[model samples]
Target chain A: QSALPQPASVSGSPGQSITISCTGTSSDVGGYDLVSWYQHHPGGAPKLIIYEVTNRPSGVSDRFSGSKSGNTASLTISGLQAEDEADYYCSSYASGSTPRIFGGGTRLTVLGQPKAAPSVTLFPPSSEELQANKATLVCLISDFYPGAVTVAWKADSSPVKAGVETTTPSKQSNNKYAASSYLSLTPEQWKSHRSYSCQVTHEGSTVEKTVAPTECS
Target chain B: QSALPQPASVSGSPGQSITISCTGTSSDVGGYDLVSWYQHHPGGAPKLIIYEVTNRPSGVSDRFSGSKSGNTASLTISGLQAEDEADYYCSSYASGSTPRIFGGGTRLTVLGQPKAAPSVTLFPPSSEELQANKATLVCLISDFYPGAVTVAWKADSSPVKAGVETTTPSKQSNNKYAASSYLSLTPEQWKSHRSYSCQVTHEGSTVEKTVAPTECS
Candidate 1:
């Protein structure tokens, strides 16, 4: 009833090799040869990298290989490159009430690439929103590398929890990444707050953009 | 850019034969041998019936055969039985922005089986709903055969549109089928309506159940 076990993440440098393991039970992994592996990058469709445990589909890179032993299956990426930095998932054909089982996804990180910080821009609510007794604040984060970021909102230096929504980082046309966050507030709440700030944490650094109620006027 | 073409429904008598066609362009069906067919019953997982244009996976029934000519592919079912009354889909490897394309599903009907009517039951809203100023009516439909039904609601013999939800028909442990529909209304609206009805249309016939406000009182 649970997903197959896999490490949350794995890392390797360029020209190095690393293996991600998927652990299951004899009812699935060890009992069947119908296991498949998939590679998925953010904002793109998943591609089949291995099928039937060890066979690669046509047009897949030879650097990706699959193997199985006992109750575990592994996907090995040799000569790792920046392009191989994506999420990998493994699945097995099961029996009984559960017919198929999939592993928890494992993220592969390719080291040695320079981390790029995101550019943040904040937009305040429009006049029409104020007339409607509501306000919405938007924070746009763009041109980031490695495609992972945490977004937060604060009101007058205190963390704000409710009515905050952040999107997942998605790859942009430029091969970098972008994400957005929105904070909602009633007109009365917006006018009472002196300042609202958006903070983006990425690669051990934080970028903050603050907006004041007077700026909208 | 669009799904492959398929007939909406097909029918055959027991011990007879039928063929379902999936029409596509030369870039998909005629250009490659990577075509697959699947058989799906309602409330169950789809099963692969054919692969690689004409090959069947092991243990599949030989009565199900696949072929292709020009831009069209065909699935021929010989000696049809009651179990063959299900949905079928065809997919092919494609080029261009679309790597794969699938046919809109085709429904198969096997003639001469005895039709079974569903037993309809209606439940009025509870006293707790009256306290909350809202009411929910439930209509349970069970024991139907052939697995297709349309549910509708009426207030005082006029059609009701909003706040109505119906579940898809699901197979029961007895091999029959069951479904349910729900109607939501304000407590005042429920008290004012003289009668509310749930109508289920299936197999060229209709079964209806009506509830009066006084029944709950």
Candidate 2:
């Protein structure tokens, strides 16, 4: 299988347009039109935006389009918005044995927006607080604008879906947003010896802090 | 942001040593010591082999070892076997905005084995054949060896599970194997202007053939 094709980064102002390139070869992209693109926001699961070169899956917006020329595939975003600022990846079915390949991903930066990446701090429950083998993790995100930010937790780097709760962002005196998320864990789960990480994404960039159970002391 | 680390490909004979490298940076492998490696066989999901730079995940074989130095990480497979001829991928935790990154997969080829990669041919049902607007796609896998191969079909490159049927490989007189898979679709689904792909995996290598619905004629 071949490496996925991708550009490093692309930048555009709101209401503008940007095109991201993903290049492959005849053995893969050209031999099969099964090229797909995905959008990745920091601290979130990737979302499929385009599939099979020129088709969008159901519910995808028309502002995002895909095209192909010979061995190279392309993704174009029209009417770009501040929310469009994210990383983009291209994937394709390689062959039978290899199956799939994914691009390195492209960072789309939407400039000219009133945005500030959040500052994040993660606090693990004290080991003494792990009475009866239960604990909670707190992720605090502060100083972000536009009132929308995300905080995610991972146990041992894999996503933690259960026992996670995020609070609505509150208005600070400086008009910024502050939000928090709580992750509950069992002592046995933590005792299995895995590190926990908190990820915060603002304006398409991410910051993360990971701590271990022993460090909770 | 820095790209994930990966080596192109590694090949070794049975009982030999092969090392695959992954290099990252201060924000990821360098800044943090969290790194993991995965092994992937064709037609199957990846499996974790190593985690946290040097620790082998439970149930993993000792033949696979991992190490790190500076900004680079490495996976070494000793006593390589024909079954070990697959792909390997490395992953690490970056900073906050980019919490995780995965390397381009590395193909490990086991030498000194009699192997034959499968050849695939795809045929899409014709409009005339779609009497009731139902169509069947045929994927033929031939000229393969080892009798343990996989055949799969995809609609527009996305995996199709609902209407797919694959046959077990039939032993050939020359000790090779032949297999086939069929994908049923509605004419409306075919008229959606998407392509279909047939993939065959044999001896850890893959072959694919793709055809459009309209080209069925």
Per-candidate DockQ values are 0.02, 0.01
Candidate 1 regions exceeding 4 Å error are: A1-10, A20-59, A65-75, A86-113, A145-163, A168-177, A191-195, A213-217, B1-28, B31-34, B37-217
Per-residue lDDT of B39-148 in model 2, one digit per residue for the tens? 76532334557778888755678999998898889999989887788778787877755445677768887767567776554556633346655666656555577667
Model no. 2, DockQ: 0.01
In order of appearance, the predictions have TM-scores of 0.44, 0.33
Residues B112-193 of candidate 1: C-alpha lDDT, one tens digit per residue: 5566788776656544345657676766677887667789999998999686756556676677877666677888888899
Q: List the residue pairs that clash in candidate 2.
A: A97-B206, A205-B97, A206-B96, A206-B97, A207-B96, A207-B97, A208-B96, B26-B31
Error of 1 at B109 (Å): 25
- When summed lDDT is taken over every stretch of 10 residues in candidate 2 chain A, the lowest stretch is A123-132
Error of 2 at A148 (Å): 38
The TM-scores that each candidate's chain B achieves against the reference are 0.60, 0.55
- lDDT of model 2 at residue A165? 59
Candidate 2 segments whose C-alpha is farther than 4 A from its true place: A1-217, B115-217
